[PDB]
Every structure is written in structure tokens, then in C-alpha cells.
Amino acid sequence: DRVAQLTIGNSTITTQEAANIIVGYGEWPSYCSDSDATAVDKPTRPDVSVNRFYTLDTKLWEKSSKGWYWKFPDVLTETGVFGQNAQFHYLYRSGFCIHVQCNASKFHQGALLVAVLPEYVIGTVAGGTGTEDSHPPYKQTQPGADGFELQHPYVLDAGIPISQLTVCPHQWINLRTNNCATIIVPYINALPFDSALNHCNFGLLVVPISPLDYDQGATPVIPITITLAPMCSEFAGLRQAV
């Protein structure tokens, strides 16, 4: 009966679920009272047009799914008006409301770990048994709004144990208990501003830890819908032509 609307795009949502909303590192996104000069040409703080409800193409969860990840702000870097701002500016800064939702029956099974890992550097295989340093292409490091699938979920495709991914801001999606998860992300960098197209401040991981299951006859693929909204987006830079 509840319809949450912010902007031009509207979304129907159940919240706040099993564990309420997760605010990353106990810190809400803020504008920047501090940075940096501060000069006359200083940040351009838009909303609510740019800072709206963006809903990515739905992903299909399968018995054999290994997991997906998205890079921020790379996902929206080509999407609508935010994509426009991020491209034709020099400096960028923002927070994010990330909302992940499943649609499944009470006869479906499984558990997703939804997490946010700042500076998510990818490492690919150097040969199954060997040492060849090849580094991931753009299609894998910055997979755009369509995201990318994990090759080795156990090591998060970076030699790092997924069993400890919960040190990062996270929320569980257990189809038995809840169908949705919400994570709030503040701007995290060693600089107040950075490049939107060259630096991905964090990655969003969605990994099945307990595999999807069902008896045969039920819908064999479960949709994972992702809605995300930038919160205190700030664009310095100025003019640009790509």
C-alpha cells in the first residue's frame, strides 16, 4: 500500500524489512562543508532531477549463479542526467542509496549477501597453474550499468575471502525472511573529490552464499532488481567534451 516517490521515477517498496536500513560506517552522505579551496567556481549541487530513482536492468538468479558486481559511479556513468554530469565534469563526489530487491515465492530458497567494498580492485587468473600478470579489461574492471559476473566468488575475484566480506557494509537477503536490502553509502576517498570516469570509489557485491533452489515446475529464475539513488552528489570541474 506504500509507494515511495522522490523525483520523476516512482517505485513500490517494502521497507524496512528484517534489519532496517544499513548506513555504511554509521555515516550519512553529506555535502562538503570543508573542501577544498573553497573557490567561486566550486561545487555544483544538483537535485532532485539528477539525484533520482535509477532502476537497472534486472538480473536473473539461477541455481548455478556465482554472483555479480557493479562499480560506482561507473554504473550510472552512461545513464541519464547523472551520466551526463559525471562525464562533462572534472571533479566528482557523491553518496548513494542502494536498494536491492528479490521477487520470489514462499516455495523458493536461498540467501544473497549484498555488500559494499570500497576500492574493489579486480585480479584475474594468471593461468590456472602459473604466474602470468595480465590485468582485467574495461569490460571487467568497469562493467557499466549491466554489471559483471564473478569467476571465483570464493576469493571475490581478488584473492580475498568472501567469508569475511561482512566486514564491509552489508545486508542479507534470505528469501525465507526478507526479499529486499537497503544500503546507504557515504563518499569514501583519500581525496574530497576525484574523477568519476577513472576512479571507482566502491564496488557493489551481490553473491549467493546459499544457492537458489526449488522443486521442478516453479519459476527457475529469480529476478534481482536494483534501484539506486545518488544522495549528496557534488560536481566541481566545469566544462568538458568527450
Binding site: 516455495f107 530458497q109 540467501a111 567469508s163 552464499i209
Partner: protein, 230 residues
């Protein structure tokens, strides 16, 4: 002319000595700290974070590595034992090595405190049943059956309650280490019950962490590797 005698152990270089040495760049002023959202000041903050406990540390194939973060029940099983007892031994070899807590103990020698282990049932909504989770204090043997396990510290976990079973392990200690550990057992109280259309097998995820009374003492570097020069 201020009279002085140099005491034993002068010109020595002690690697743990904490003094002030000459600044290489006296006039240099480092980039000032900005605020960064996450900050850790004590590792015990990290020890208090639930991480997945690989109770099912049995498969050793690259393709089956994800199966160690889970461990299932199934309608097949009678009313006997689900899975043995991850010794409550956060620093020793075994399941605890998957947790951040276990890995942080590896950089220390002694530890002591209480532990929490949260079990999360990821079965169908339509699935129902009861498990018996028991903790056995050090020195004690694994309880022979469900009935004798019930006579001790235990929680009876029904699936009217999703995961809100967090077992608390009273105390862990390394007064000796440089049956002498706790024991946490999981039994079928009842069989696994499902209607038509629900999967007859479901998986449990175990998350573990230390409580705020947990402390570690003697720092000690152990390792795996770091790349050689070429």
C-alpha cells in the same frame, strides 16, 4: 662540562625501542588529514564483527569451495546428529580460520573472552522443524546422543524463528597453548518437514564473532607468502 657516565647498552639498536630520531625533512608539512568515513583504532573492533564460519571445511575443489560457507539439513536425515562440533578454538586449525576473528588471532599468541555464533536458516518459507544446538565446555566429551546433549547447555531452535539463534560461548582461554576446547553440537530434534513443491534440502550459514570482553595479548607474525624480486 655536565658530568656523564655512559651506562651499559648504549650504542645498541633495539628494534622495538621507541625513541625520537632526527627528522629527514624538518621544514616539510605533510598533507593534512581529511575525514574518511570508516576508521579503525583497535583491532578488537574487527574481532567483534560476524564473519562466516566454515563449519563445513570438507571440500577441497576450486568448484566446491563455496560449499564450505554452508552446511545442510535435509528431509532424509532421521533424528540423529547434523554436524560435529567446531571446537570453540578461534585460533586453532579448522573452521574458525575462515572468520576474520580467527585470522586476527593468528597475529597474536594469547586470547580470552566470550564468543557468539549465529546460525541462519536459508531454507524455504514453507519448511519447518527443530534443531538442538548444544555447547560442551572444555574437558567434556562429545555427547553420545541428542538426549544426553539436552542435559547440558542447549538451545532448541525451531523454524518459526528464522535465524535469531545466536549461541553464546561463555569463555575461551590460552593459559596453555603456545579435549581442551569447547564443543558446539547440532542435532536434529525433529525431522525436516516440507509440503509438496518445497526443496527437500536446505542450507545453514554460520556467522561468528567475539564479544566486547574479548582481548588478545602477545603480538606474533605468522604468514603465507609475499612475491619475490623479479
Amino acid at each position: 662540562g655536565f658530568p656523564t657516565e655512559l651506562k651499559p647498552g648504549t650504542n645498541q639498536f633495539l628494534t622495538t625501542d621507541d625513541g625520537v630520531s632526527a627528522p629527514i625533512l624538518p621544514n616539510f608539512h605533510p598533507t593534512p588529514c581529511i575525514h574518511i568515513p570508516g576508521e579503525v583504532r583497535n583491532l578488537l573492533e574487527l574481532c567483534q564483527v560476524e564473519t562466516i564460519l566454515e563449519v563445513n571445511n570438507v571440500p577441497t575443489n576450486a568448484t566446491s569451495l563455496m560449499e564450505r560457507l554452508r552446511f545442510p539439513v535435509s528431509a532424509q536425515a532421521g533424528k540423529g546428529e547434523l554436524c560435529a562440533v567446531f571446537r570453540a578454538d578461534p585460533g586453532r586449525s579448522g573452521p574458525w580460520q575462515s572468520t576474520l576473528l580467527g585470522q586476527l588471532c593468528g597475529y597474536y599468541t594469547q586470547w580470552s573472552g566470550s564468543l557468539e555464533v549465529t546460525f541462519m536458516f536459508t531454507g524455504s518459507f514453507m519448511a519447518t522443524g527443530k534443531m538442538l544446538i548444544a555447547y560442551t565446555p572444555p574437558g567434556g566429551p562429545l555427547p553420545k546422543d541428542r538426549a544426553t546433549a539436552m542435559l547440558g547447555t542447549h538451545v532448541i531452535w525451531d523454524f518459526g524463528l528464522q535465524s535469531s539463534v545466536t549461541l553464546v560461548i561463555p569463555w575461551i582461554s590460552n593459559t596453555h597453548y603456545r579435549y581442551t576446547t569447547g564443543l558446539v553440537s547440532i542435532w536434529y530434534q525433529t525431522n525436516y518437514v516440507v509440503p509438496i513443491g518445497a526443496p527437500n534440502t536446505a542450507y545453514i550459514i554460520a556467522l561468528a564473532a567475539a564479544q566486547k570482553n574479548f582481548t588478545m595479548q602477545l603480538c606474533k607474525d605468522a604468514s603465507d607468502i609475499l612475491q619475490t624480486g623479479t
